Symmetry: D3
């Protein structure tokens, strides 16, 4: 009965994201992994690609649902009947931005609670941006990505 | 079903704590507000006082239980069959210490998840320490405390 | 006789800016709200639009003067006979950047003092960028903008 | 016309404090350098010593007044008819605590504005605590102190 | 026998960079100042220009070698037989990013040690970006750049 | 040839310290692990205990020398003919204090360079203080300590 949304750009989904969504499914009955189209960020992968990659990478988790969206995130939460919004916290920089976003989301949807999870030590220093930057210079990022995502990233960069 | 602990010194409990525990009760079935018995620095209020004040200030929340404890937070969570540890996040100093505690707690009790909540803007700058310091120097702290705590703090400082 | 400048991009001016400039006029005899053309930031509103919006939003403050500029900000301060440069401080990120800018400005104009004000709790989490991002997704930002600015933002996004 | 207070422990006053108060005197008509009487941690110098040292070190500034006080900072500002409270900002730890104090002071005395000034690069890493710690361990701190304070600190440490 | 690499975009090299590389040559036998082509950052100066500017600005240091590169930085370190990677640390923002990069580099090349140096007070607030921004508005940046670099920057902006 | 000091309280030495000193020995010819004799806060272990524990835990490193000292760090470095002072960096709180210490040490001993190293992800959240606090509250800290220190800490806490 408790529904949570885990929103992000997931360009592409990393093992840090897999850790966060896994921890969310151990707390809440149903977790919506919500992939924002994010045209302003000029993503490497299309929304359809990101959704497909995330679906395969989370297929082993029975209470996850992957959906793409372009809406205001508070409206999308309401429309999914979610009362929790999950964010992962890595460093001070995101923490300050996440605090601003959480105050804005509270204004837009007061009954949506933002809950923050801290990453595992293994993934505390990675981001999609850092992984792409390493891969673009032909550095090994197999440790940081689900197998299907790593294959897709190698293929994208080969073109 | 889902059991969460909200540990702290609560010396005394403030409206920032009430905000956090209220948010936790809207997320989880049962919330244990856990008051540490023997703080490193001699608290202004005794454990018995802190428990009584917190019980009165949370009596309106049906799924809160106020309990004193003298153990390691993770040992207490384990014995209470809690799978969520609630922490409030106010500033950067908070975030960095909390990250260290969360990594340590994951080592001590892997089946315990640390969840971080953000206070309302109204309470994001207060702490029990700041309220006590202002009150001891004859400043107005009525806005930041439950009525019963306001009364108890005035009585303490009058002697 | 004490003249202060409050510089920024003001794209568009928000209620956080209104709070800062209002507080500045309670401290200093004359405040110049100085709007930088900022072509490098590709602003949503033209400089003329930003100046007009800020003029209307501050018309109730008798000792404010709104001016657009493209100059080095230390030169513009000197040319306005200002000895104080006002900046609002929201989080750690701007604080560090503001410290760098203040040291550079001190090098360029040693007699120009940078003074920093802290925002009201109400506006401590907003920025022009965040308001635009919410509005672009059709979220309600009426609370955060002067009425004339909100109308102009809705109209801009309608085209 | 404009009255400002610059409160602190000044145990002892350093060249960083002299820098801040000098900058304040170039901004405001009258600056009260306000020395707290009963610090939480037993100061190295008595209140009478700290006041005498600060008076000598600021005697060349015609619009500074050095005063001891034992009250809440806002209560003292109010009774001194000050409308500006001066704080120096050095690092991130400074900024976060100062933000909390400023929000509290706005609650306690809405007609008091908190103004933050930045030290010269020369003094941005010093504090009375660091200077005392270096001096007690037989390090050279002459550069960081007014001559009279250097003399008084050497005498204190010799006994 | 101890070889260190000091990588960066150096667009253009500043006196802060000169300070760091000078300190590195006092610690290590041979220092490679490694200039990344950095097309993603759309540099003002071409790689060949940046290399030539850095060579002239470090010609007085006998154990510095300036080289341009487009490789993964861990691979370039290995190929230069370097076991130390030098980074300068200015503020909290770079510190957090540098920590992420250092953890990634440790994954890619475990025997490459990242060592961080703190800048002189004189250069603690400057960056290539800030210097370019000031120069683009015709502000004086002679204090912050080697003579040859300042001439080249003035000439670039004159076109 | 190159002599470095690694100063600290080491109360007790942890695996984070072992990591840092091991990294330092791979960079410099001789590393002095320097244990401060009279900490500001009464250490859990006496100086003789801390030195013996650190000697045993570093006996496998051929170019480490464990020495107690009661002086200013810079005075000790100078007398040991060290030109490098090693510090470990864990978080933002670490970074800001270390920046202040490094600027002061450059004032006290210009020929001493401060070098900052980053701990493995495995140890980036631990400190002697956190380990002691967990152990005194009956938590498992075996993973974070050399075996000899684990034994000594258990014995200390048993009495
Ligand atoms: C309060 C607030 C601020 C910015 C927002 N952007 C959106 N929608 C798009 C979106 C959601 C996510 C996640 N990523 N992206 C690009 N909703 C917002 N809500
Ligand atoms: C990981 C960790 C670190 C310190 C700890 N202290 C405790 N218990 C005592 C305690 C808890 C609170 C709240 N206050 N006090 C005094 N448990 C801990 N767990
Ligand atoms: C020391 C320094 C650094 C950057 C500068 N940019 C300018 N002028 C343009 C400007 C001013 C403001 C406000 N916004 N913008 C875009 N003056 C500068 N001064
Ligand atoms: C909001 C706030 C918080 C703490 C306060 N302490 C005081 N007065 C005592 C004081 C001032 C200084 C400087 N040092 N000392 C000991 N006024 C306060 N106001
Ligand atoms: C771990 C990691 C992350 C990003 C990387 N980018 C590169 N090569 C290009 C590069 C090196 C420098 C310095 N600047 N630039 C643009 N190597 C990387 N290694
Ligand atoms: C610049 C500076 C600041 C404080 C200092 N304290 C010392 N020596 C005493 C000391 C060193 C360590 C480690 N622990 N303890 C107690 N040297 C210092 N240098």
């Amino acid at each position: 009965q408790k529904r949570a949304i885990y929103p992000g750009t997931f360009d592409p989904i990393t093992n840090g994201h897999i850790d966060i969504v896994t921890r969310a499914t151990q707390m809440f009955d149903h977790v919506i992994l919500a992939i924002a189209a994010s045209p302003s960020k000029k993503p490497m992968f299309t929304l359809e690609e990101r959704v497909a990659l995330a679906q395969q990478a989370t297929a082993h988790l029975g209470n996850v649902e992957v959906v793409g969206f372009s809406d205001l995130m508070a409206n999308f939460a309401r429309n999914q009947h979610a009362t929790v919004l999950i964010r992962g916290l890595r460093a001070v920089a995101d923490f300050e931005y996440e605090m601003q976003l959480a105050h804005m989301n509270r204004h837009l949807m007061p009954e949506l609670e933002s809950v923050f999870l801290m990453p595992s030590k293994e993934w505390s220093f990675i981001s999609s941006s850092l992984v792409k930057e390493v891969a673009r210079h032909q550095g090994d990022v197999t440790h940081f990505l689900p197998e299907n995502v790593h294959q897709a990233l190698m293929a994208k960069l080969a073109v």
